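#struct-pred

JT: dropping the chains for the assembly here, can someone run the whole complex?
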Amino acid sequence: AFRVLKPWWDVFTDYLSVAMLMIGVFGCTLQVMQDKIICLPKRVEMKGLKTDLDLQQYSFINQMCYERALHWYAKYFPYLVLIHTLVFMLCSNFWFKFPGSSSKIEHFISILGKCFDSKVKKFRLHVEEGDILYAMYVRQTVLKVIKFLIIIAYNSALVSKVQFTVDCNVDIQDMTGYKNFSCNHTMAHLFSKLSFCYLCFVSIYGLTCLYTLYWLFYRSLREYDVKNDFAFMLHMIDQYDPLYSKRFAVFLSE
Amino acid sequence: PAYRILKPWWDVFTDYISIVMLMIAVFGGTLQVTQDKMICLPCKWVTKDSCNDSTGPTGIKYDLDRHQYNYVDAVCYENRLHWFAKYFPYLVLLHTLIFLACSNFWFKFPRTSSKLEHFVSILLKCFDSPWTTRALSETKSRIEQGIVDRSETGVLDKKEGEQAKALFEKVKKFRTHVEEGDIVYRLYMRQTIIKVIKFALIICYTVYYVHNIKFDVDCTVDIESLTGYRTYRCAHPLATLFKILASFYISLVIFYGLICMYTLWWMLRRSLKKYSFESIREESSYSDIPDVKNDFAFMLHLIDQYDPLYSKRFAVFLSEVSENKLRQLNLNNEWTLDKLRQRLTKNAQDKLELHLFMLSGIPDTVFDLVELEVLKLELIPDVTIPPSIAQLTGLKELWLYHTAAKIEAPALAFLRENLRALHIKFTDIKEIPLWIYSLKTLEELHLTGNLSAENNRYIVIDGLRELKRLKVLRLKSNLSKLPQVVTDVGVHLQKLSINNEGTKLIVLNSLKKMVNLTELELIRCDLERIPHSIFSLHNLQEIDLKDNNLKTIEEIISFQHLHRLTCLKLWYNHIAYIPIQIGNLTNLERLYLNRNKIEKIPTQLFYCRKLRYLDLSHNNLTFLPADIGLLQNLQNLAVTANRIEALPPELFQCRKLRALHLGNNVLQSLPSRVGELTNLTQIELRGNRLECLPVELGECPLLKRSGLVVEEDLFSTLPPEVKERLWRADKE
Amino acid sequence: PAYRILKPWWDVFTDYISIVMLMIAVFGGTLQVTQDKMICLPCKWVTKDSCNDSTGPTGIKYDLDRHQYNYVDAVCYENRLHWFAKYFPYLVLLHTLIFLACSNFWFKFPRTSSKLEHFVSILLKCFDSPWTTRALSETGVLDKKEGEQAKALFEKVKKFRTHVEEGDIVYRLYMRQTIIKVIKFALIICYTVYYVHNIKFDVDCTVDIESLTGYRTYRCAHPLATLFKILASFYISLVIFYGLICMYTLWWMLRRSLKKYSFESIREESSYSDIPDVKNDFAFMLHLIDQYDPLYSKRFAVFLSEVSENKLRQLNLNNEWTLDKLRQRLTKNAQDKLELHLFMLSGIPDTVFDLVELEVLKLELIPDVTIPPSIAQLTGLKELWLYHTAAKIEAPALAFLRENLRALHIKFTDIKEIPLWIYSLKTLEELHLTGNLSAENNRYIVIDGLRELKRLKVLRLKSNLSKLPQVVTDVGVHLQKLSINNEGTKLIVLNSLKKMVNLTELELIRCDLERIPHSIFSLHNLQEIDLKDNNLKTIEEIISFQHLHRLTCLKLWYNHIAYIPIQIGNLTNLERLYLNRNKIEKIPTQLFYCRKLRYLDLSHNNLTFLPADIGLLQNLQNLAVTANRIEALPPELFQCRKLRALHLGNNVLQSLPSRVGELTNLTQIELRGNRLECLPVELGECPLLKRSGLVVEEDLFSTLPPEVKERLWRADKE
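RK: done, full complex below.
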């Protein structure tokens, strides 16, 4: 009930989701450890430009500007990717974490193994009364397409938001003596390429979902005789392996 | 799991090298993500926007906070550090991952994954097949006589034999499904070419950009409003370590590229779309091992790279000789002795019969029933008699039906002393065994099938002169001339039979040299005339000339030559009159003239007082001459399908008339003298125009209903006591 | 898995030493990655690029900000710190990795991994075979299944030896691995010992940056240096061990010359002479296994031997042929003897020597049977059949057969199938040679050793002999019975048969003489003559038979004899005369001058009348005229009251004479196939008659009165 149930596009989606989760965890670790903003006051052989600021004052300016000036997307991109990848994985695996489908697919695998070795009459009664599993799979794929479209569309704009340099006009005066500060986000230029790779992975995920749309909406898999549920669960194993359908069709024949 | 045998050595080397290259990528990434910095110092003296490089010495006061140093570090590192130096670990990781994806493209892909898993499972179960090692352990007059060398037999269990059969079936199905594909090979070529080209690209661009990684850099980022300095000289602490890592990585990539180039060169040189397969069978003498096509020679070459032996354990499973041997062994274990004894029958000659019709081969379990007498083998392809036939002590007759049978030396030795009769039915001359002529005890020989030839006719059977103890001979071949070999060998034959079934035969005076002959049957020879030379056979006793289109038989007047002419059969002809000259034939005890156009019975015929059987049915006969009383020896008379409507009294003067066939006539009434037939056992009356059956019929001592052929309607006329006694004789 | 037997002790020690080395490599690597640094302070007074070392004490001011210290630390660390002090752990890790690759190269390399797993799979089952322990105990009764498994494992061992002995790949890989390990250990020890002293706690660097710091030289501390040195020392010591052990292995791989395995100690102690020396690529694995433990080598030696296979085959055969079934199949022939007929077996079972009541042994199509001395277990045996099998014999067996054998049957498909040693026997009296030994220009040469069979009295020949062999004439000086059967082949004597004066019986069956040779009339000791089926047409030569004064039986049946010469009446001595299956239509009266005639068979002839002289013979006991044209029995035929046999079948007799009841010695008569109206009751009065003795149709047998039938049934019952 593990290997035969996975078409090749499903395996591609699983691997891409694993890679995205790895990227998200790496980004979260970088955010936790090495994420910081370096700030300087705007305007006071060459010499220094002593602003006579203590280390504590510099750190206070850093924290204020980082919490205020830095864009929210720059601060929460890793957790955003983590949440999206978790939702994708949870949606994909919910089809089998659900006890009802766990009862259906277990019986389907038992009968498929028994038919491969060399109930079907009861199977075509209790199993063909469904078709809600095909609709559930179609709705899950549509939801994944929705997520991919929303992600790419809204992320392609905010990806340019993260910048190495940044400016903050914060009311830190009478505590430090300045009002305007020029700062840099050290890992911003790394986050840019990290987000670009994440966008490429999401785009490939969406293309896989689009091809699954072709597979789901080209030949009306409701009929094949067998009902919609049995036709769908036959097409699945046929996609996994074209041969098992021939060895399963035997016991249906009278 | 089980796919360890798929990978050649060059694939395991690339697996480990990819592991190492990914390990150094992880190490570089975790080193750079944490410890990668730049340490910057500004230059006070600047000319042309560059570091001018111009009482103990003292330090140089740049008048900068540590935070300004951190800011300039971040800016300079972000701006003026070569991108390769800042992203080498990630490029290495990406290249390793795509290498691994290439190495596992054809495994995660379920399409070819199904083929590979099926092939590895089948190869694994065939390698551990118990019968494979046993089959391997099996390891010029004689050839042209039809004699073959010894065949060695063992014993096998039922379940393991069925397992071997099922494995053979699975191998056949798999070869049918896979031999056509030529898909996995294409994907393997694509993967190898992708690996080679990617190695080329990276080995180019890395060695191009590796010089950029330098310990010390100079950056002019132009931020004076924040610091007041223009140009800075900085140090990259990890630059030397990254240079070492890059050199190590390109060395590993060079090894990977060499291995991939070797793989490509080997695959291109081999031309492995068809496996050679010749050395194994040439050493093992298993000629039924064809060269397999694409998608199956590639797998054979891969498994040969892993271990050559695994090809041999499959080769014997791909041979038709092995299939024949295993099927024959399961056949030997198939027919139970009890099944054979149930299948034993009784023939017309009171002999035990085993008729093997359209089987795979001779089951050696049938050689355990010592009581077998006649062996019939119909449509078994090119079987060979094993020596075990010596166990059949009671075997006397051998029947071959379109079987190009061979034999072994001990089996031929046994049949040289225990065979009496041989029946051959052959559609082709080659089907006749050539070892038959060495059987010195063969008495009866039958040949069925057209042996007719042009310019070599009656030459393939010239070995008949060697069978000195040959007595009987029957030929059914549509011949036109008597064979010279048979003409010479007939001097000791006691019976010669020919069934031309249409062809006009000429005796050409070649029949009178067989003086020892006693019986002569010539059916459907289209003689149209009785040749004279037959009378020269002074020892003949019977003769049948059925369906020879005879119109005059007046020549039988020569039959006075034969002093022992017992019978003469001339049925199935155009005989309209029986010549009176048959009155000379006093020796006649039986006679057959049915299926003719005879209208009357000549009185002179009744001069043959020794007649005991007369069958003249299907004729224009309409009356019985009164001289039937002359033939006191008659026991069976048939007038079926004739115009008989009256019976003279002398019909009942023969008291030993055993049976009668008086049905299908126009007999209106039966004389009351029927009770005179004290020896009447069987009678036939159906078809007669009778009205009332005689009561004197019911007193016959040997009358029974089974011997009473008559319509039940006319039989109802008999007295109830007659019917009751008939039924009682039926039950008793 | 079970690879722990393929790893000697030294490989285990190297495996653990490599683990410890890798552990210290990782420890050094993480130390150098995380906490490695230099701490540099400038020297104010510099003399030739060297520190001169020239109201209380006060701190020395350098006027350097912290980042300047970081920069000088980085630069001095990059330039003046010895590379062996920075990259020691990485070198250790690389060396450990390549050492581990060398140690596990042959395991991952599939071409040798296949051989290794093959051998280690075979050795495990050979170690725990149920037959092995019993074979060790024997220096019985077993299951059929275990014997079959033992034979299958013998097959596997043979094929595996053929597959492995040829290769010679594992040994080359092992040699190369150990060579590489030793040479790399030499390199690393050399250069590491050379450079280990370059790790110093304090280093002086003249890095040439005055435009950034204003100072020329710096003195620096390397805090980890001491620790690295310890690891460095603690590394090389391990390598030293990892060197020595490998060196030992190299010596161990170059001392015994392990391509060959002597195996002689166990075969000497346990007495298994068929334990051969094994060639390259297979002795090596056995050597490694022995280095792990010697017991597996012992458990493999039994299956490697050849006498063990023969003993297993014998034991399986003996277990299969239990005495019960062997006695069940042991039955009696028609000659009233107990004979053993083993047909198409693998060999001679050892249980058949379990009897002393055996006198006939029949072995047919049983290949390569060696005659053991155990054939002495039966001393009264006198008959032996060897059909299609040339058996190999032993000296005790030959000596036993030279005095205690009488009948030897040799049916051979080939000339070589006749054993030579059979010529050495001296007390033989019955011989039978079946098989076409006739050959061109080597005629009758295979039988050259027949001369020594002086005691022989009976010799039968069915060998397609076209001419009479000369050795037959040699052995005919003392024969008592000579049988020659050419299977219809024409036999030519031409004055070569009259020299056997002592012969008492002559049978020339199907010799195709077509005419009696005169030499037979010279044999005055000859008493009974058989010439069956020789195509005899004129037998007037019987007029010379008067030269035979003890000729009481003549056999000239199955021929084409037309008429019987009346001169046969001169042979008054004859009691049994056989001339049936011929062309005889009339019987000469003079033949009935032999009143001693008892057996007269003339069936399958053209007879029509029985002469009145047939009753002149009082000793007439058997009459057989089956398949003839006899019409009625002459009255004189009832004169012979002792007519104990009567064959009248397939005859045209109309009525049965009533004189048959006058014969009371009638013991058997067959009437089936005759045209008889009814059975005369006189036949029922014969005291010796029975139902089984009489042959007649039941529907006519019932015509006799119920009293006669009941008496006949009672006499048949008891």
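JT: nice. The CA atoms of residues 213 and 661 of chain C lie 159 Å apart. Residues 225-255 of chain C form the longest helix (31 residues).
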